[PDB]
Amino acid sequence: GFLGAAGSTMGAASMTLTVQARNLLSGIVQQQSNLLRAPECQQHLLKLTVWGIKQLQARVLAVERYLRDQQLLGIWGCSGKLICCTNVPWNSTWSNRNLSEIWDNMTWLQWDKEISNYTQIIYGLLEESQNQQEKNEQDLLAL
Amino acid sequence: LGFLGAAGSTMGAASMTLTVQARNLLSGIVQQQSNLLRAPECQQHLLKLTVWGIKQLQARVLAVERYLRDQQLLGIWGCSGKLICCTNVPWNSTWSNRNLSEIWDNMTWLQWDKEISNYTQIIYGLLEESQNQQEKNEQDLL
Amino acid sequence: LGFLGAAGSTMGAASMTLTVQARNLLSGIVQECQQHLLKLTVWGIKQLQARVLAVERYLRDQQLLGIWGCSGKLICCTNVPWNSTWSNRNLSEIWDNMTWLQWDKEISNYTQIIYGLLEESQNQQEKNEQDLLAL
Amino acid sequence: NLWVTVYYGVPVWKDAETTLFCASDAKAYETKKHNVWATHCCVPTDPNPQEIHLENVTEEFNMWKNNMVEQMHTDIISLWDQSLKPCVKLTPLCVTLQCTNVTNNITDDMRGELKNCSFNMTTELRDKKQKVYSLFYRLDVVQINKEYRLINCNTSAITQACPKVSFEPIPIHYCAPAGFAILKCKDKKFNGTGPCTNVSTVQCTHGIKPVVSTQLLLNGSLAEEEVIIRSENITNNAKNILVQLNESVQINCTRPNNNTRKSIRIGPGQWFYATGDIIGDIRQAHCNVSKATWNETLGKVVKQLRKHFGNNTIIRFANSSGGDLEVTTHSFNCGGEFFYCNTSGLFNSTWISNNDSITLPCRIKQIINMWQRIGQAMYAPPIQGVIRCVSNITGLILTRDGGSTNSTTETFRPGGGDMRDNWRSELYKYKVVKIEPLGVAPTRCKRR
Amino acid sequence: ENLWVTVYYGVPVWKDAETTLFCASDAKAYETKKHNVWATHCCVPTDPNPQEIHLENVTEEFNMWKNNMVEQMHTDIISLWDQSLKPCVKLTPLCVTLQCTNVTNNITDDMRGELKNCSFNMTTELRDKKQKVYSLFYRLDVVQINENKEYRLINCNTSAITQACPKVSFEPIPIHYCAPAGFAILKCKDKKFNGTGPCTNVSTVQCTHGIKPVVSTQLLLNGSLAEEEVIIRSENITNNAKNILVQLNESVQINCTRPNNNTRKSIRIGPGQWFYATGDIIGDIRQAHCNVSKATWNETLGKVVKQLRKHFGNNTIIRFANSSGGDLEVTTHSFNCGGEFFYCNTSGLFNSTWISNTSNDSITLPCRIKQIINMWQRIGQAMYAPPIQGVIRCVSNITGLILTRDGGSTNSTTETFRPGGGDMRDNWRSELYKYKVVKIEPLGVAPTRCKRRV
Amino acid sequence: NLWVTVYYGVPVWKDAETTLFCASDAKAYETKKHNVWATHCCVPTDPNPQEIHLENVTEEFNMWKNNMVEQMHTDIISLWDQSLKPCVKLTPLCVTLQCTNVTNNITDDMRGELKNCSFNMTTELRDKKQKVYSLFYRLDVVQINENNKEYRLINCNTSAITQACPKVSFEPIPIHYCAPAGFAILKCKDKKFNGTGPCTNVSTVQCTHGIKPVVSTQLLLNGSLAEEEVIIRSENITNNAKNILVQLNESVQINCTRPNNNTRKSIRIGPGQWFYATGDIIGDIRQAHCNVSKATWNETLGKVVKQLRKHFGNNTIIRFANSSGGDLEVTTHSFNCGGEFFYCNTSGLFNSTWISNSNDSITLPCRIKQIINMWQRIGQAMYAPPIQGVIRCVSNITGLILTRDGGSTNSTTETFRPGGGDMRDNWRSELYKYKVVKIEPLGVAPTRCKRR
Ligand SMILES: *[C@@H]1O[C@H](CO)[C@@H](O[C@@H]2O[C@H](CO)[C@@H](O)[C@H](O)[C@H]2NC(C)=O)[C@H](O)[C@H]1NC(C)=O
Ligand SMILES: *[C@@H]1O[C@H](CO)[C@@H](O[C@@H]2O[C@H](CO)[C@@H](O)[C@H](O)[C@H]2NC(C)=O)[C@H](O)[C@H]1NC(C)=O
């Protein structure tokens, strides 16, 4: 189920990526499957303005988070992919543990706390790698 | 032709120039918001009472959410970034026994929607399963 | 170096900062007591309206990128040949000795022709791919 | 051997309900800056709107299940309530009034119609009182058994309309929000429902004047070809019959009195606009209709009605039945005053087969129980000068007598009063359809 | 051989975060005609079953005294009350000089002088019209002016008073809090969870269990029972100033009644503005009271004593006493029974001394009714509860109680526990202690042996 | 053979207009004394604000067509309305007032300026009335029944008087206007920028610098100073209807004081509605006045005339004169000081003629007015409650507002008069450097690559 492999190690936990990945902004399909609530529910929200503004802010925040995640995936050259290798070598500064020690004997939460300091540098390097790859693709198309 | 100019054309002919509707889905939003802001001024008249503002803003948010629902459904089926994509789900004779010449000519898209409105959810589920299997195979190939 | 860092640089040199230029479009600045913000008259809809406007502009740009046949890619080529009518200028005078603002002002009124050609070309390519994969 | 394709951008739609946003011609904004509709409908329209014809497209319409009518009705009521929301309340007026008959060069028809009332009203200072006088129409006062009170002195929240606010109808356009579209039916002789074959899509409806009237529609759009008769069930006598004319019948209404608007302070920044002395002679308000034109119009309506009842059908007309003044007489708000005209002179002919003008007397009342609501009312300020009103009749509302017997002599008398009908006589060619571009279909190709 | 970055989308990682939740409830629809404030609000259905997706080998830290949902629920309830009460009749013409006399209508000694028969010159403030009326206001709502005698309402010098719409029902139907998309609610399934610290048996749910937003003081009502053991919770139990939230493992039944058969007296103020005064009371007038089954209360207090001994040492004398002085909001047991506001004197329950060395009678609690409510202990708003016709009866379950402590200096030979509370967030915490709201962050990176092809 | 290519994220922009959101720097709670500029402006600014220089960039600015000023004016108007909306209404005040002169140790300067009014006022109970007394200044009170002793409030016949909420301060706090997502603010750093020309050395910023939304007339208080020179700006220098905004490069110290030690009464008027009335004065009565350093003002006027000569010819008789006729909002120097509203007659400053030829202070008298029709609106009038104690506001003059006279004939002698009264000018001097532009990330260009 959702977050079922939260406590499992990273190696085993990587098999449930699709379920958790899809559930992200599941509301975009669920609220429509809920028919945007019953017709009287829309009237209740519209009549009392503070509730309407509150739930509207919640929906807009959810949409913005989803778009930010998809933009981050797109700008790294991994749009529509759940797993993707990338042309960025791993630095020893970020983590110098053996591969078995990372993909086994450690959960995703522990790893996330472990490399919480270097995430922005990783994202910057991924963006640079994608941009250089795109420039090289343009050059090769010219060639 | 126009925004719905192909609505009466056959399915084969109307499948040409799908770009107009897909573009219009958001071009309408942006043009209406451009004509609403900085064109007439009178913004405080819109915000004269909260109800008009919340109604229009909720309409905009629902339009964006419907568009994102369609794009997410295309992405889940492996069809992101395309208007025409072919899939690995075979067509069941149960859903409609008509052959290609019967339906792609001498038939409009509205009649097609009325004909197979029953099996849309089933087709969506099959497409979801097929793209999940393709994604699992791609992960294994890594 | 940052946002609009190459706004005055030449077109070729400014094409390297596309990543940061694209990143800054959606993140914004707002991401603080909310009790005195729910006010409908001020700090209320107007703000949410600003957020929805930003999201709508970003979505229009991304949908145009999707339909033109260049999806999820900052730099991309296409099958529409460059018309001499839009510009008789050549590459050495374009990718050097001119900034992006000047170029955008130079070809401002052929943009909707170019977009129509791009959309038609991508639709042709999609139909051709469908036909080829059928055959 | 066929495989599913997924198409995005398919031209398909489904019937749907949504909220339409108003839009008006911006060119009349400055001239009509204080108008309610110009203020609300600030969104400018396309200066040259374009409609897309849908070749080979048959669509089904139903004007009596149209949510656009409900949306327009709710928007109109909301507009009026908002426009009267900030204006001064007239609860101070509810005091015992010392009234006497006008009897100053009045004609026979207006004897007892106007009263000259005096009373004590609050002043700028809370603790001072002033004695003032004003003229009220007989329909705006009730005797207390010389002592009079207003009609809803102690039972309704009377609110004065802001005088600067103009209630003149102006054309407005209901435009669909993005993602939706409006289908316009262009069939001639479209009887209001069923399939329509000449269909075109539009992003904005044609200009619709939000005119308010009860028995006869005003300033509408003329039908094509002959007079068109519409009804959800012509045989069911409980349903109103909306008749649309193909010829405008001109009406010249007037209020031959040279009124002066006396301005009185109620309190801080609160003004009462009373009807001062009547300058000149006092004559009844009346409306003129060309006699030959109206006779021919009734002839056309009778001829078209005969197709639904029989060739040997005798059709006669009768004046309105009993009820409140708001629904038993023709009413309209032209010039900033609310007329109430007795239409028994229009419907008094038995059409069994086959320069002069008919003068309809009209009463005027200031306290308006608008929208047939109880406990809420509006106080229309008086308008200075003689009022002259020219308006086109374009559609009647009539109800066939409930004859249990053969009723071969079909009797049609004015009814209506349901404002949804007045909005529905123009907003009938349109429906709102939601676009659903995503669709599927089979092909020979599979993914490779 | 060498290690490269690898982006994952769908990582099960979350961070604690404060977010906006949308209320949800069962789609009964017919019940209360959707006039219940918790029917119009919380109107999205909760038809799908709870997920309750267990998390194996997951240990999460909880803190019920720093839960975002408690503050969010409190603010939501206050906002909902204000919105529902806002479009109702204003009673500003009532704040006049009231001439009052005692009722003396077959009043028993318990209610001797508790009801005041007040009459005053009402006016609509629209015209020069005076209409004398009368109404039987309760004593607590009416205070002397010239210290038969002239009185005014207690809210006259504090705030204007708004009548509650009779059509609006405040019955506390159960509701569920569901997190928006992208967030998830983690619940702690450990039996005898003590409020804070790590919890091992964890599960994920999209919506919390049904919570009844019951407003009360000194005794929670219609809550959730503990799991086979009385649980005592406190942020800092050794600090006396912190309220000790006690949850029971068994319910104590209370029958609360108002035997007076009173009627309404509709008085019109304005154009559709009606004020419902209290008309004559039919028959004999007796004191409103609540009955608590004595043996059940004895056993429950004994169990609470045992669990308190587990924390304060099992040789200490634990003594219960009636609450201290203060406003009726905090010194008494208040609750909304059948639409009427009760205020019950609870000295008859917390009256016992328990020494550490080891029938059908019922305890009667006197209760005083109050029509004018200064809800939520705010200054600037007041509510008038309309009279309710007929005898009122409520049968309620006491699933918990709030206790405060008075330290016994340093010797601490005897610890005095008294009922207390009045901070309504302690009422919601008894149901929202189990749950935490977290923000899901599917993105992540990690090293592996792979090279992106180009 | 060149081919189209599409770039997303191109650094280009167009002039646009959008709603900017407020943001303040580290308000925390020290500055949040229920301040309208702190409580409602919840969003915080970056502790390290970012500025990005744009090398080889030139843009056309126009302070007189800038939409940021209009947005700021609308925002402050709406903020004022929301602040005063829930406060107590003073409709019961508009009653017949019995007033007498105040003669308790009153100096000759303030004779007849301060009146002692007693009047009937309601209580919490509608059946009772209480006779109370209060002090009102002459400008707040108008005489009625002349044909002597009875007065009404000045806004009895035009508008309903709303009280300003106590413990709600309109003190200016620095405000940073930030662009939403997808927009950017261009900052013009060109020294001696005259407001309308092209500007080099442009830089982009997420937020504007600290803007104090100060309200003043015919003088600008607590503003950003010019650099290296006094700057003269105007939409059309030769148009007599356009004001001349002058920005000083050296602030002029101004001390303004209300030496009266006022007390404040507190009277109930309704169910929890309180009305505040100027009770009595502890000490003697002396007029509110402002002090400006004489030599510093002389030097500042010299610099202003020196700069005006460049625009009006060196051989020009620059002559100053006091304000023309009009209401006190336009003719005098108004400003909020400690929550009390001043009205200072500035004719003691603009009284110098220029033909190209110590330690004293120019004591400007000032009147105090409580009932205020702010923002040139007659619909509503706020009532500013009195403030206990003695008020002193030491502020900086950082800009003048001059309106040149006609001078068509005998143009040798041109006369300047203080003017203004349009609150937009009070912020045009702060927002002249900033321009709002939307980003057009998409673009096309020719290249030599074709898709496969
Ligand atoms: C509407 O339908 C008619 C009839 O199908 C179309 O007219 C012709 O139909 C034949 C097929 O029977 C085609 O081969 C022709 O190309 C059609 N056109 C002409 C001019 O003969 C008509 O084109 C259709 N119009 C649309 C779809 O807009
Ligand atoms: C409408 O018709 C009536 C009658 O034709 C006009 O009222 C007056 O009627 C008398 C005959 O009874 C004529 O002598 C007058 O000429 C008529 N009025 C005048 C003097 O014009 C009435 O004028 C017409 N009203 C309008 C405005 O159409």
Ligand SMILES: *[C@@H]1O[C@H](CO)[C@@H](O[C@@H]2O[C@H](CO)[C@@H](O)[C@H](O)[C@H]2NC(C)=O)[C@H](O)[C@H]1NC(C)=O
């Ligand atoms: C502000 O400076 C601009 C130029 O920097 C002035 O505008 C110029 O005026 C001259 C007249 O001598 C014209 O020849 C130029 O074409 C104008 N250029 C532009 C860009 O407007 C403007 O008059 C100055 N305004 C003030 C008040 O000093």
Ligand SMILES: *[C@@H]1O[C@H](CO)[C@@H](O[C@@H]2O[C@H](CO)[C@@H](O)[C@H](O)[C@H]2NC(C)=O)[C@H](O)[C@H]1NC(C)=O
């Ligand atoms: C503000 O402007 C004055 C006026 O120029 C500056 O003071 C000096 O003024 C004399 C003439 O009075 C000039 O000859 C000097 O060149 C000026 N000094 C400088 C450094 O240029 C004063 O310094 C200026 N202040 C600031 C902070 O810029």
Ligand SMILES: *[C@@H]1O[C@H](CO)[C@@H](O)[C@H](O)[C@H]1NC(C)=O
């Ligand atoms: C499903 O098929 C039935 C015919 O058996 C039809 O009546 C019904 O409308 C169909 N459902 C939809 C959604 O079209």
Ligand SMILES: *[C@@H]1O[C@H](CO)[C@@H](O)[C@H](O)[C@H]1NC(C)=O
């Ligand atoms: C269109 O752009 C070209 C090149 O920039 C320019 O020469 C021409 O004047 C423009 N046309 C119009 C109508 O502005």
Ligand SMILES: *[C@@H]1O[C@H](CO)[C@@H](O)[C@H](O)[C@H]1NC(C)=O
């Ligand atoms: C009235 O009808 C005439 C035709 O007789 C037409 O010319 C005119 O425009 C119409 N006016 C209105 C306001 O409908």
Ligand SMILES: *[C@@H]1O[C@H](CO)[C@@H](O)[C@H](O)[C@H]1NC(C)=O
């Ligand atoms: C209206 O239609 C009739 C035929 O039904 C026609 O004779 C008449 O001319 C049309 N309108 C007018 C007045 O021209």
Ligand SMILES: *[C@@H]1O[C@H](CO)[C@@H](O)[C@H](O)[C@H]1NC(C)=O
């Ligand atoms: C109505 O008045 C107009 C002038 O406004 C005139 O041309 C027309 O003949 C009149 N018709 C009637 C019936 O009064």
Ligand SMILES: *[C@@H]1O[C@H](CO)[C@@H](O)[C@H](O)[C@H]1NC(C)=O
């Ligand atoms: C109304 O009386 C006024 C008196 O000045 C006169 O000027 C005006 O013309 C009169 N209007 C009419 C048409 O009676």
Ligand SMILES: *[C@@H]1O[C@H](CO)[C@@H](O)[C@H](O)[C@H]1NC(C)=O
């Ligand atoms: C009306 O017209 C009809 C013909 O349709 C004619 O028979 C009748 O006499 C006319 N009546 C009048 C009064 O015009």
Ligand SMILES: *[C@@H]1O[C@H](CO)[C@@H](O)[C@H](O)[C@H]1NC(C)=O
């Ligand atoms: C939890 O850990 C135990 C070992 O202590 C292991 O046997 C079990 O499979 C783990 N369960 C998971 C996958 O969380």
Ligand SMILES: *[C@@H]1O[C@H](CO)[C@@H](O)[C@H](O)[C@H]1NC(C)=O
């Ligand atoms: C009510 O009863 C008490 C006690 O007898 C008495 O002191 C009081 O005066 C009575 N008041 C009235 C109004 O009867």
Ligand SMILES: *[C@@H]1O[C@H](CO)[C@@H](O)[C@H](O)[C@H]1NC(C)=O
């Ligand atoms: C709850 O248990 C934790 C154990 O980690 C302990 O630290 C804390 O003090 C306990 N609190 C109470 C109120 O029992």
Ligand SMILES: *[C@@H]1O[C@H](CO)[C@@H](O)[C@H](O)[C@H]1NC(C)=O
């Ligand atoms: C500036 O003002 C002069 C009058 O002094 C006028 O002739 C000229 O047209 C104005 N120009 C502009 C651009 O405003």
